[PDB]
């Protein structure tokens, strides 16, 4: 059924979101970030104020 297809899609999305939630945050979301911790020249690419 179409409902079953939608349910499968939500299962895929929930798996992906669970993996994101357990996964360690990106470098920009540690609060204090050091030059060594982040990738080299990351700030140039990113937009910060």
């Amino acid at each position: 059924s179409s409902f079953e297809k939608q349910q499968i899609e939500i299962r895929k999305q929930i798996e992906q979101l669970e993996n994101e939630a357990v996964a360690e945050k990106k470098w920009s979301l540690k609060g204090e970030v050091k030059a060594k911790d982040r990738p080299e020249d990351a700030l140039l690419t990113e937009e910060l104020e």
């Binding site: 080299e40 020249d41 140039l44 690419t45 937009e47």
Partner: peptide, 21 residues
């Protein structure tokens, strides 16, 4: 090898700056 990677990073930065510009 390393110099090539540095060149590639410079190109990527230049492209992003152009995209802002």
């Amino acid at each position: 090898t390393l110099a090539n990677n540095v060149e590639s990073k410079l190109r990527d930065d230049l492209e992003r700056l152009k995209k802002i510009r």
